């Protein structure tokens, strides 16, 4: 077989209310006896959840809940898998500079406020490292009809991205406050928002 | 461990703008110094064509040769879904390697394009960002660039395209503008080339 190790979501590690996880997905019915051991800076940990997946097209999935600060301070996380000789797989957050994002919600054209539904754009600029989470709300309630671009390497070595939220011309005209909510390690309490409305 | 072959499409800009020269390219990598003679043959809907420019390059990173064959093509032979095949011959190969490419069959839909002024809150800076917002297009291939007074600008960055919830694609391009340029009233244009657009082109301008 061959294994792939994935990082926690950056929003989960920066938000103490959330549950970050390191995930080990191992590729390759014959035998379903495969043990997955886990290590943080080479000390074995026994708290992972593993559930099995027989694929018809196997892959087993083991998720290690992690301490937020272990990821942030750069520890690695390793998964050793068993079922030849066993496969190792490591992962960590590398060290480097931090620059806070600048966040801007852009007013939409008028010709768009005409349509039954139109897009609000949030522009996020000047940040390092590139990992970032961007989502939206409406009157403080979680909103989901948005899409983010991938981050792009800008000329000064920082990153930028945009987020686009779809809105109902009816919800806008009733005075709903829309906000772009951005989570990044360079921000106060790891979060910042920008608001726009009809108003 | 012997030669391998990659085929590449024309730039979308070069097939959509009749004045430019699109090409289909076949690249052979890991050609040995001991067997440098590579014959590439080219077929358009399985009829052989003989006009490809084929040259060899020495690749110093790892002591290999690279053979690049660029077939110039008709803009409409790409747009109408003709198949372009390269066939590569070399004495290190048991039998020829063949690669085929074509413009895939699928939907067409023009992008909505808006250029947006800088954020109110960026106007305390030495430089500002203009945003070209490009929405609702199929297929995903697109070219986007900028100009100031017809000079091409180079200080812009495009995001990759993103699959939207309706199945179309969107993208943004951000241009950096010096405060003084913006203030003296220079005209900034976002130009977008897509097969959906009447005359394959739209250009949106902004200033003030
Ligand atoms: C010996 O060394 C060779 C040097 O390699 C470099 O590799 C790095 C690791 C560094 O060490 C660097 O210093 C080295 O110089 C090495 O050759 C490479 O080997 C690879 C094969 O193992 C091969 O990988 C494939 O690349 C495909 C993409 O290729 C393009 O993108 C790269 C940049 O990412 C670029 O470097 C290449 O030259 C290709 O660039 C494109 O070229 C086309 C054709 O010219 C351009 O299109 C034309 O453009 C003109 C004008 O310029 C007109 O527009 C015309 O009409 C067009 O036709 C195009 O613009 C250009 N793109 C870019 C971005 O520049 C991948 O597609 C491919 O992956 C596919 O397939 C694999 C497997 O089949 C799958 O795994 C993938 O999922 C995917 O489906 C794969 O990655 C490299 O391209 C090749 N590089 C070069 C320079 O030749 C060699 O292997 C080494 N050998 C040994 C034994 O070690």
Author numbering:
A (entry chain B): 238 to 265, 268 to 296, 300 to 325, 329 to 444
B (entry chain A): 236 to 443
Paper text:
With this expression and NMR technique we investigated mouse antibody fragments and characterized differences in structure and function between mouse IgG2b and 2c Fc.
Mouse IgG2c showed a closer approach of the Cγ2 domains and a more open Cγ2/Cγ3 angle. The DE loop of mIgG2c Fc N-glycan was shifted 2.0 Å relative to the same loop for mIgG2b Fc (measured from Y296 in an overlay of the Cγ2 domains). This DE loop displacement was due to the presence of a Leu residue at position 300 in mIgG2c Fc (mIgG2b I300) that forms van der Waals interactions with Pro271 and shifts the Cα of residue 300 by 0.8 Å and R293 by 1.3 Å further away from the E strand relative to mIgG2b. Mouse IgG2c Fc bound mFcγRIV with 1.5-fold greater affinity than mIgG2b Fc when both contained core-fucosylated complex-type N-glycans. Mouse IgG2c Fc shows a different organization around L300, including Van der Waals interactions with P271 and an ionic interaction between E268 and R293.
